[PDB]
């Protein structure tokens, strides 16, 4: 279901604007600045050791937001190239489902409130496992397996 809050930067999506409650989280690991100038006046904050950048909604676009989110039980979730099976605390995909140019994409959840962003992955030999940032109820952290590429 792609019926969510939306953004783009220098034509690339460049990580989705996670209007998760009162926020404008913008996962731009790579080049881009605001094409979707409907809220251009961002008070940008960043910390590159968790790759992400962020700001706050004033009121103008608050009707575009989702409610808050952090839960991650075992099972499977959904992303822009199909299903993503999640077990042993990590997301996994069909080998080759992701590629360069998949530069920041959500895992949009099964019940209508976002979790995580994908940034890359490793080939296991026949499985593929993702490199990801995730919300831990408090803090934010990175998951990354042995030998992983980034996109």
């Amino acid at each position: 279901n792609d019926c969510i809050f939306e953004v783009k930067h220098e034509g690339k999506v460049t990580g989705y604007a996670c209007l998760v409650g009162d926020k404008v989280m913008k996962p731009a690991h790579v080049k881009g600045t605001i094409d979707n100038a409907d809220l251009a006046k961002l008070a940008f904050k960043r910390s590159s050791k968790y790759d992400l950048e962020c700001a706050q909604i004033p009121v103008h676009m608050k009707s575009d937001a989702s409610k808050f989110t952090h839960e991650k039980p075992e099972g499977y979730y959904n992303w822009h190239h199909g299903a993503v099976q999640y077990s042993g605390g990590r997301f996994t995909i069909p080998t080759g489902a992701g590629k360069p140019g998949d530069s920041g994409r959500p895992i949009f959840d099964n019940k209508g409130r976002v979790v995580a962003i994908v940034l890359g992955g490793a080939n296991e030999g026949a499985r593929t496992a993702l490199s990801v940032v995730t919300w831990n109820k408090d803090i934010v952290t990175k998951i990354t397996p042995e030998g992983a590429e980034e996109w």
Binding site: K49, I139, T141, K142
Partner: protein, 48 residues
């Protein structure tokens, strides 16, 4: 003068201990700031 010239910057008064008060005081403020950084350096490099 029937005596050796002073060390001019070496031999201050016994009551110069103001220099140990300020250098100890600022040295401890630096050590506390260094500890406060070493603590959150160690948490932000143990949260991956």
């Amino acid at each position: 003068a029937s005596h050796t010239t002073l060390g001019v910057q070496d031999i201050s008064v016994t009551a110069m201990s103001w220099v140990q008060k300020i250098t100890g005081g600022v040295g401890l403020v630096v050590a506390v700031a260094a500890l406060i950084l070493i603590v959150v350096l160690c948490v932000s490099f143990s949260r991956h």
